[PDB]
Short mmCIF file of C-alpha atoms in Angstrom, two decimals:
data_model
loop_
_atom_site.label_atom_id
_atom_site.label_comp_id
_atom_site.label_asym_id
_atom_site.label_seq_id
_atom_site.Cartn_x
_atom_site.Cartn_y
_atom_site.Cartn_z
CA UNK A 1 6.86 1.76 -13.62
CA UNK A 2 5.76 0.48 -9.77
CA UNK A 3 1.88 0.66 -8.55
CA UNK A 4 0.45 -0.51 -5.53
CA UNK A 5 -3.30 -0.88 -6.23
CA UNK A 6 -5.34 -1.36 -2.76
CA UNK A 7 -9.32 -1.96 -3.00
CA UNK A 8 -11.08 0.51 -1.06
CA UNK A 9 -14.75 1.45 0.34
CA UNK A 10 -13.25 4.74 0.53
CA UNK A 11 -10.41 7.28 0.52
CA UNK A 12 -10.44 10.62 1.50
CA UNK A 13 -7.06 12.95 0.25
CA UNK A 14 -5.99 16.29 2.12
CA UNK A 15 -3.51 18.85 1.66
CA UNK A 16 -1.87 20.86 4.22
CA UNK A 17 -4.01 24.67 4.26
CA UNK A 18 -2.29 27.49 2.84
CA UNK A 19 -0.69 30.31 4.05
CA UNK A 20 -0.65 27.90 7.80
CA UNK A 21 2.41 26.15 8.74
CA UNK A 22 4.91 25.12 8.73
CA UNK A 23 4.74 24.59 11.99
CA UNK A 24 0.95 23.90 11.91
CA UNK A 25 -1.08 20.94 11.60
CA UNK A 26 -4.31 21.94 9.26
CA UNK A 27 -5.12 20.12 6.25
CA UNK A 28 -8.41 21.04 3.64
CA UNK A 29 -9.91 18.25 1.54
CA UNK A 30 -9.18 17.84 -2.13
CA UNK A 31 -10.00 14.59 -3.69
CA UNK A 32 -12.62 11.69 -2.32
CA UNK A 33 -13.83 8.54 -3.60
CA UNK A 34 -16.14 6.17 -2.44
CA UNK A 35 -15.69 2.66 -3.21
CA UNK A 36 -13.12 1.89 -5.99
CA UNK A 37 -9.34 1.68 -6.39
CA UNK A 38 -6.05 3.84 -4.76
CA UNK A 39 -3.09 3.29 -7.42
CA UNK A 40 0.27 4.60 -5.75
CA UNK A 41 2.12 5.28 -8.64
CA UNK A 42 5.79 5.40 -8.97
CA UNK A 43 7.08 6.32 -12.83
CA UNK A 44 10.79 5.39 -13.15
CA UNK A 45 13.48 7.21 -14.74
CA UNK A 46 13.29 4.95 -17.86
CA UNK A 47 9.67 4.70 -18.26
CA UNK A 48 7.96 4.48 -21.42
CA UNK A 49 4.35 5.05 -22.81
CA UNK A 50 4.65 1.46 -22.79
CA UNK A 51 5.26 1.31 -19.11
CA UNK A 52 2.57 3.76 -18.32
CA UNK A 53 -0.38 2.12 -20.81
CA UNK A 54 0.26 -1.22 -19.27
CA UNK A 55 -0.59 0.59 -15.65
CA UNK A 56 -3.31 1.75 -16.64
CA UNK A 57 -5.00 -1.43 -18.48
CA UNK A 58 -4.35 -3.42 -15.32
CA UNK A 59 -5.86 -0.88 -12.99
CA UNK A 60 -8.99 -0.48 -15.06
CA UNK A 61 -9.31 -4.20 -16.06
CA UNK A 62 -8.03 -6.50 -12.85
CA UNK A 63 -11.04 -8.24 -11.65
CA UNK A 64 -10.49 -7.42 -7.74
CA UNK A 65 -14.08 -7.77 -6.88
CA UNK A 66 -16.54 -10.70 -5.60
CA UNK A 67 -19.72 -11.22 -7.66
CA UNK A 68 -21.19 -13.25 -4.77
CA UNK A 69 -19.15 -16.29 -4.04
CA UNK A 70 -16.57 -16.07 -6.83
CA UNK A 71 -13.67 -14.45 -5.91
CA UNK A 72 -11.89 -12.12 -8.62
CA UNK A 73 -14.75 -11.41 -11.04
CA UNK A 74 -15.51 -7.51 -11.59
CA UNK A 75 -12.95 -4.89 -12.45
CA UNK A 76 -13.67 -1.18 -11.19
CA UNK A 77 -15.30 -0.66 -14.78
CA UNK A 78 -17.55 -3.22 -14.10
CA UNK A 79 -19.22 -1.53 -11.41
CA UNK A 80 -18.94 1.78 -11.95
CA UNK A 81 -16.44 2.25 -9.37
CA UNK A 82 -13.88 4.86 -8.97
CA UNK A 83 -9.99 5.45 -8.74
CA UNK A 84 -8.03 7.80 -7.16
CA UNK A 85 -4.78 8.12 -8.41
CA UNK A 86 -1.80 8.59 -6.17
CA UNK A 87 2.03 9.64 -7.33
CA UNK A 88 4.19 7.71 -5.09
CA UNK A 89 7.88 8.57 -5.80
CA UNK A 90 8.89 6.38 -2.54
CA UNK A 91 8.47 3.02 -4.62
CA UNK A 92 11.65 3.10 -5.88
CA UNK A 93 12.82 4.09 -2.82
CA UNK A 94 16.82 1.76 -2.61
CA UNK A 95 16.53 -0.18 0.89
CA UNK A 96 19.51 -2.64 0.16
CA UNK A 97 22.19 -0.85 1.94
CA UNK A 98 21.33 1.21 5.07
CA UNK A 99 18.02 2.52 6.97
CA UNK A 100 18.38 5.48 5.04
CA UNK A 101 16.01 5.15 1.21
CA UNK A 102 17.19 6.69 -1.22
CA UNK A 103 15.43 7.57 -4.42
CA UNK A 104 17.75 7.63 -7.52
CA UNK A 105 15.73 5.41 -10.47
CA UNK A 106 12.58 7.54 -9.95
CA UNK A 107 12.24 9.78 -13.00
CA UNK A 108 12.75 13.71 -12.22
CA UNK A 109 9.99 15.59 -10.69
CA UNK A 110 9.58 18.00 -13.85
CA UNK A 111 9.31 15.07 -16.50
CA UNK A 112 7.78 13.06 -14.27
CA UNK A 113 4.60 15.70 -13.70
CA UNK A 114 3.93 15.44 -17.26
CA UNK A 115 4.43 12.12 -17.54
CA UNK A 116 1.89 11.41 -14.44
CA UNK A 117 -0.68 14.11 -16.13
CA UNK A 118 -0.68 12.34 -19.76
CA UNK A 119 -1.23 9.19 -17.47
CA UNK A 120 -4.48 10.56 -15.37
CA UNK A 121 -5.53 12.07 -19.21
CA UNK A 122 -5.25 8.34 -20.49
CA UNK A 123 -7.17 7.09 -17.36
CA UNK A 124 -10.09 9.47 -18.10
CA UNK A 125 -9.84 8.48 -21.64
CA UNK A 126 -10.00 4.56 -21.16
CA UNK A 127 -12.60 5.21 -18.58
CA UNK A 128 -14.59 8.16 -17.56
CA UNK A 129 -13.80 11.63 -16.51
CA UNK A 130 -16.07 11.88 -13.59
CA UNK A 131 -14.06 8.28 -11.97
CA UNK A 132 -10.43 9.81 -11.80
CA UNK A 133 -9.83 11.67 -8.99
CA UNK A 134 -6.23 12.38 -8.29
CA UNK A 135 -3.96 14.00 -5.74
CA UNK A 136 -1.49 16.91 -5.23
CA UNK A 137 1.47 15.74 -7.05
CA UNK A 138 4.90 16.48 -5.01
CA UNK A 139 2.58 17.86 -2.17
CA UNK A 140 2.17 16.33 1.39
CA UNK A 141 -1.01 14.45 1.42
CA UNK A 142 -3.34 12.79 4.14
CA UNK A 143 -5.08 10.26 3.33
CA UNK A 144 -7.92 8.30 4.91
CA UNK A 145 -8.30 5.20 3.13
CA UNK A 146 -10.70 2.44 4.04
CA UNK A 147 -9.14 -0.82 2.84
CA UNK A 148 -11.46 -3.11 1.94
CA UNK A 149 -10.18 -7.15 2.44
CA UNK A 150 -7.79 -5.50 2.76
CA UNK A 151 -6.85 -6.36 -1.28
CA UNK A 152 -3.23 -5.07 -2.10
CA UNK A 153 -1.34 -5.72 -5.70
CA UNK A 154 1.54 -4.46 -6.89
CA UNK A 155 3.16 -4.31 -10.13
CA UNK A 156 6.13 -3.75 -11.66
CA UNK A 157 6.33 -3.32 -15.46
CA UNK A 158 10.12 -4.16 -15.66
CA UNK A 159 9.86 -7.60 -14.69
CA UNK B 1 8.44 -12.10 1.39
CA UNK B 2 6.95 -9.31 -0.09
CA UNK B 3 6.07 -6.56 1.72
CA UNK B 4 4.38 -3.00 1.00
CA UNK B 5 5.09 -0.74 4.02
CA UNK B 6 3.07 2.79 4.72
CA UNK B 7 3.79 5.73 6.94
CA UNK B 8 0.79 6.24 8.73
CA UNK B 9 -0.84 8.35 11.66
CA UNK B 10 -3.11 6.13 12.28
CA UNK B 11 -4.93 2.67 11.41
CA UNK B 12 -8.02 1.06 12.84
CA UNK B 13 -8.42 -2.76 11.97
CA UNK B 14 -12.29 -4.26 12.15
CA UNK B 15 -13.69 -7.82 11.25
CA UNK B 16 -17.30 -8.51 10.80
CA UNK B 17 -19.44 -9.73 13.68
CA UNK B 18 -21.96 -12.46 13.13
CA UNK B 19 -24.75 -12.26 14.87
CA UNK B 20 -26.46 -9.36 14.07
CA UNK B 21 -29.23 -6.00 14.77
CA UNK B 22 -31.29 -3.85 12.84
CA UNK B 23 -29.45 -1.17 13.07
CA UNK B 24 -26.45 -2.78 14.58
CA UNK B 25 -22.64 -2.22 13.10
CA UNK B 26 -21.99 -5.58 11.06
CA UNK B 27 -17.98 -4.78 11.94
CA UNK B 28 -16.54 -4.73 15.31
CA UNK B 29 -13.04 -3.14 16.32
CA UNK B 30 -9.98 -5.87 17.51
CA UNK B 31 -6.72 -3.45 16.75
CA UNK B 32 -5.59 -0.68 16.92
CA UNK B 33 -2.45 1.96 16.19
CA UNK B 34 -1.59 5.60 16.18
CA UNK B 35 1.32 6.76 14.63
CA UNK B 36 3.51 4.23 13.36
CA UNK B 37 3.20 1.71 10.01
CA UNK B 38 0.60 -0.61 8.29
CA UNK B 39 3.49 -3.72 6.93
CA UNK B 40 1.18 -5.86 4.74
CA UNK B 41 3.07 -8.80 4.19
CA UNK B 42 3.16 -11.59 1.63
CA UNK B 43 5.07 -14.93 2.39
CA UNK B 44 6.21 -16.73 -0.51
CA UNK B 45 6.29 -21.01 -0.56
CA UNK B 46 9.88 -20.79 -0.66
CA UNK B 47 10.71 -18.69 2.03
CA UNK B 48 13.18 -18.81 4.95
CA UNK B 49 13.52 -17.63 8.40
CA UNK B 50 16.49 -15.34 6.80
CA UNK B 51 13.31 -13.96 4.71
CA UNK B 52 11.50 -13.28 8.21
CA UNK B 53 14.27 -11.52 9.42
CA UNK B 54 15.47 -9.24 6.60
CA UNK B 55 11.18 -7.72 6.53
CA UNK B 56 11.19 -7.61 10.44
CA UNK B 57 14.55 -5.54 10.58
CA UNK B 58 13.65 -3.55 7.47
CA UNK B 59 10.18 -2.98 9.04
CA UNK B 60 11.83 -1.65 12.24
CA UNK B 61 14.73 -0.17 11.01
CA UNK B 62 13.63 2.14 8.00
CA UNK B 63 14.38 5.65 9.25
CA UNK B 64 10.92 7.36 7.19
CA UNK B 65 10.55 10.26 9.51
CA UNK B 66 12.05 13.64 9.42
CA UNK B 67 13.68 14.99 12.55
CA UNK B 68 13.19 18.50 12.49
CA UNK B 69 16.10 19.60 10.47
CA UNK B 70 17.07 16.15 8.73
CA UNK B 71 14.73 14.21 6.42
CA UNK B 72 14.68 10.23 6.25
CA UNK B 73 15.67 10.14 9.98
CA UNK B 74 13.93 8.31 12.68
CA UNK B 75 12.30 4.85 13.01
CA UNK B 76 9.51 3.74 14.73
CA UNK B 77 11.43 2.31 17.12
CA UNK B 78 13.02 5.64 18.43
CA UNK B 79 9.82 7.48 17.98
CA UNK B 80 8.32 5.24 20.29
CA UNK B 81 5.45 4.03 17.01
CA UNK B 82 3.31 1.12 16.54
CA UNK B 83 3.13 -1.54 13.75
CA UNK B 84 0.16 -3.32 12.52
CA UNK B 85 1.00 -6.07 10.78
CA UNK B 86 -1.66 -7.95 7.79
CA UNK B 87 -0.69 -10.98 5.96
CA UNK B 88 -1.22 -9.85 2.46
CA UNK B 89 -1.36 -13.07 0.15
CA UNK B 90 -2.34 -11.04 -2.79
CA UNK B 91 0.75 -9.31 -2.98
CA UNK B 92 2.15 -13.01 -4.94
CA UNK B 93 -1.13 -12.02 -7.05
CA UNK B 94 0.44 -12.66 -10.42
CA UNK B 95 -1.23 -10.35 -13.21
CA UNK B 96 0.40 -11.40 -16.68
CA UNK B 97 -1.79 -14.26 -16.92
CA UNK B 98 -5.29 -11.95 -17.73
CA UNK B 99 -7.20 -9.86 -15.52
CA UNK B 100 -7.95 -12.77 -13.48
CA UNK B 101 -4.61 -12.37 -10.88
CA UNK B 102 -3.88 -15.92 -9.23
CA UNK B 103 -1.59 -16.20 -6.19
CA UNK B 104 0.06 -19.98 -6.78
CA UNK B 105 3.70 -18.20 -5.69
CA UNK B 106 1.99 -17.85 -1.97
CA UNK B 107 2.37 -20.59 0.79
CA UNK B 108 -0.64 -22.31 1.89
CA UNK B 109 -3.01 -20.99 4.18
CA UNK B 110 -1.51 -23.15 7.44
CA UNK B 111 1.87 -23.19 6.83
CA UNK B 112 1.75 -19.41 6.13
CA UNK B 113 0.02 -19.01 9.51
CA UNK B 114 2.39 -20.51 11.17
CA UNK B 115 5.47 -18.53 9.59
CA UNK B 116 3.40 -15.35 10.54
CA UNK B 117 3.11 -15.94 14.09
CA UNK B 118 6.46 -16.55 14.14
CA UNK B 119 7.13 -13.24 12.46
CA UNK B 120 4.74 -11.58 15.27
CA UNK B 121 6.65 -12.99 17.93
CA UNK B 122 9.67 -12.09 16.31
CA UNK B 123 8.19 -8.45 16.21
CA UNK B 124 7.39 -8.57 19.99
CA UNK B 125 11.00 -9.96 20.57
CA UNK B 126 13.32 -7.07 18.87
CA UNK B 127 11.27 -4.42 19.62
CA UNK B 128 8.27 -4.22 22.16
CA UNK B 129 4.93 -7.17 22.40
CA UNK B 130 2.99 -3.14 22.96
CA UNK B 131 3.89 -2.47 19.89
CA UNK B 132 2.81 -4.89 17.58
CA UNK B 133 -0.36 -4.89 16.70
CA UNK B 134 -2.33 -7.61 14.19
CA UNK B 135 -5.34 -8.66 12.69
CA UNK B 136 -7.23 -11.82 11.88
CA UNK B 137 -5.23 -13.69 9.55
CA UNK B 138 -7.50 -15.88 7.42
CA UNK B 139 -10.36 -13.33 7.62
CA UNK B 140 -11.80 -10.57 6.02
CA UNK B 141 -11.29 -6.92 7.08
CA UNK B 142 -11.90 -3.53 7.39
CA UNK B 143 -8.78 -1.29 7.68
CA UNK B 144 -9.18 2.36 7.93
CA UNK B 145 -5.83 3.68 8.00
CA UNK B 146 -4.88 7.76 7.32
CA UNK B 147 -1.46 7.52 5.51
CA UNK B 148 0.72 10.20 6.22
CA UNK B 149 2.94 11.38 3.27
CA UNK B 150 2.01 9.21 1.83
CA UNK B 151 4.79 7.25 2.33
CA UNK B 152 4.96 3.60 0.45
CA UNK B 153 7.65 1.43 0.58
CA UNK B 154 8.40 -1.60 -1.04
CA UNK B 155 10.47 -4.56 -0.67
CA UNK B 156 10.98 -8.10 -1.71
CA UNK B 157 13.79 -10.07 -0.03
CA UNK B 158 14.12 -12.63 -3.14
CA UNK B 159 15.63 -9.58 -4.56
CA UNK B 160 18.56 -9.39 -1.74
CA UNK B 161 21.24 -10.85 -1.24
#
C-alpha cells in the first residue's frame, strides 16, 4: 500500500453538486477537519490486511507534532486530533516511460472500495468514530487543505 | 530526490512575521499560485544533478490534465500553470525505526540549499522565472493549497534508471 500523510490545521473536502455539470463548476461540502492528519491512500493490487493494518498504526501513532521545543513528540491520538482519510489511486500512478501515468498495480475499483471501507472501519476502531472523516471514494474532490510546516511522509509498505 | 507532486487550483504560501499586534495576523503572505502544482521535494545526501533533472522534467512534463475529450493530457507548461516548489526534508522521514520518524537519508541543511536553488533556477531556465514560485526554505510555513482531483503523484529517481 502507498500513503502520503501531510499535517494539517485544516482541510476542507467538496464534491461536485448534483444534477449540475458537467459543464459546471459547483461543488457542496462533505467532509472537514480541523487540525489533524490528510492520509492519501493508494491500496495496491496485491495488498494485504497486513498492508492495510500497518497504514493505519503509522497514521495513528507517528509522532508528527511539537510538544514545545521537541520536535516529533505527539501523534494525532495524543491530542485529540483528527484524520481525514483520502483514496488516492494516482500513487501508483507508472511515470518511468512517457508523460502519460498510467495506473496498472492499483487494485480494482470494486475490491478496492471494500478494501478502503474495512480500512476507515479499522481507523474508527483503533481510534474514535467521531475523528475519521473520509471522502467520496472514485468521486472528484476539492480540497482545501491548510498544510501545516508543511509536514509530508510517505510510506510504502512493500519496501 | 523524492518528490510528492499535487494537481492543484490554487496554493497560497505564508511564513510567520515577528514582530507582532493584538489583533494582528502572526503569518504574512510571500507566494503565490493559481492553477498549476504544489512539487514538495526531498533531496537525498547522495544525489546528482541527473537527480535534479529527472524531478524538474517530470515536474514539467507530466501531462495530469484532461483536454476536453482526452484524459491525462496537458502539462502545465501548455496550460500556461504555475509551480510552487517546497523543499520537503521529511519525505527521507524513515518510519520503521518507531513512531519517532528520523530523516538521516536527507542532505544537510546548506548543502541541500544550495542544490535547491539550483533546482529553482533550473525551473526558471526550461520553462518560465513567472512561473516558479517558492517558499522559505529553512522556515516554517503555512500552505493553504485547494487540490484539485485530488491528484498525487509520486516519484523517487533512485528508483530510475
Amino acid at each position: 500500500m502507498r500513503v502520503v500523510i501531510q499535517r494539517v490545521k485544516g482541510a476542507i473536502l467538496s464534491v461536485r453538486k448534483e444534477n449540475i455539470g458537467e459543464n459546471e463548476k459547483e461543488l457542496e461540502i462533505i467532509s472537514e477537519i480541523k487540525n489533524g492528519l490528510i492520509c492519501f491512500l493508494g491500496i495496491h493490487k496485491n495488498d494485504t490486511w497486513e498492508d492495510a493494518l500497518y497504514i493505519i498504526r503509522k497514521c495513528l501513532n507517528l509522532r508528527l507534532w511539537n510538544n514545545d521545543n521537541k520536535t516529533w513528540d505527539k501523534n494525532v491520538k495524543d491530542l485529540n486530533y483528527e484524520l481525514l482519510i483520502v483514496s488516492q489511486f494516482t500513487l501508483f500512478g507508472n511515470t518511468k516511460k512517457g508523460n502519460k501515468p498510467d495506473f496498472h498495480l492499483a487494485k480494482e475499483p470494486n475490491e478496492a472500495l471494500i478494501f478502503y471501507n474495512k480500512i476507515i472501519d479499522e481507523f474508527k476502531k483503533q481510534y474514535n468514530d467521531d475523528k475519521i472523516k473520509i471522502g467520496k471514494f472514485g468521486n472528484y474532490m476539492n480540497i482545501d487543505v491548510t498544510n501545516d510546516g508543511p509536514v509530508t511522509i510517505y510510506i510504502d509498505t512493500h519496501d
